[PDB]
């Protein structure tokens, strides 16, 4: 039981690390989406 | 009022030419990546207004 | 007419004042007491 | 001549911006796929925790 | 069972949000540790 | 989460 609890704790630490990486990717995705919208406005204006 | 309106039109044309010169200088003086800095985007937002 | 006869290329559809003067200095001349006619504009162009 | 040079600088920035927009769209798709993959791995880890907890409760 | 699965999804989303906030706090903590170390070295040097 | 998973497994 103690070994299984230690394995659960280590696996939940790896789970937290994976969620950290996924949410960093999500924040980068939001930044890229904002940059894409700004670049689309830039593309329209400088097309004019 | 017509004289004041003509003065306003002249000031507006001066504003057009200042925008043209500022946009030319901004696009010429970066010497790098346009999409990197947000100062360029802020300046072009001012140009859009 | 002589340039047309000699086949020297010149742009017909342009005004002398607009070719030889900037709009900034035209506005500055109008601010500093200059009449708005084209002869006075040409005279200011000669004066500069 | 300098007016044409300033025009040519601006058009090169236009082409660079178009290429950067294409690269940003590709990177957006790549990051979305990476986020989905990491979410699937996180769900697999959650199922692993559930299975380990069930095994510990049974034992 | 469907309601339990929906509650599972909501609870895991709240878990992900809480882990996201905790890891943002951790990144801020690491930045604070770096600032504390730099400011302590600065304090020693400028005390001398 | 574990309690809800156990309840769902039981029912």
Numbering used by the authors:
A (entry chain A), E (entry chain B): 3437 to 3484
B (entry chain A): 3727 to 3775
C (entry chain A): 3534 to 3581
D (entry chain A): 3195 to 3253
F (entry chain B): 3243 to 3253
Sentences from the paper on this structure:
Cytoplasmic dynein-1 is a conserved, minus-end-directed microtubule motor critical for cell division and long-range intracellular transport in eukaryotic cells. Dynein, a member of the AAA + (ATPase associated with various cellular activities) family, forms a 1.4 MDa dimer composed of two copies each of heavy (HC), intermediate (IC), light intermediate (LIC), and three (TCTEX, LC8, and ROBL) light chains (LC), with the IC, LIC, and LC known as accessory chains. Cellular and structural studies have shown that dynein primarily exists in a pseudo-twofold symmetric, autoinhibited Phi state incompatible with movement along microtubules. LIS1 plays essential roles in the activation of dynein, including relieving autoinhibition and helping assemble the fully active DDA transport complexes.
To visualize the conformational landscape of dynein activation by LIS1, we incubated full-length human dynein with ATP and LIS1 at room temperature for 5 minutes. We identified three major species: individual dynein motors (Open), Phi, and a third state similar to Phi but with two LIS1 β-propellers bound to dynein, which we termed Pre-Chi. For Phi, we obtained a 2.7 Å structure of the motor domain and a 4.4 Å structure of the tail. Phi dynein has pseudo-two-fold symmetry; the motor domains have true two-fold symmetry, but that symmetry is broken in the tails. The nucleotide state of Pre-Chi is the same as that of Phi.
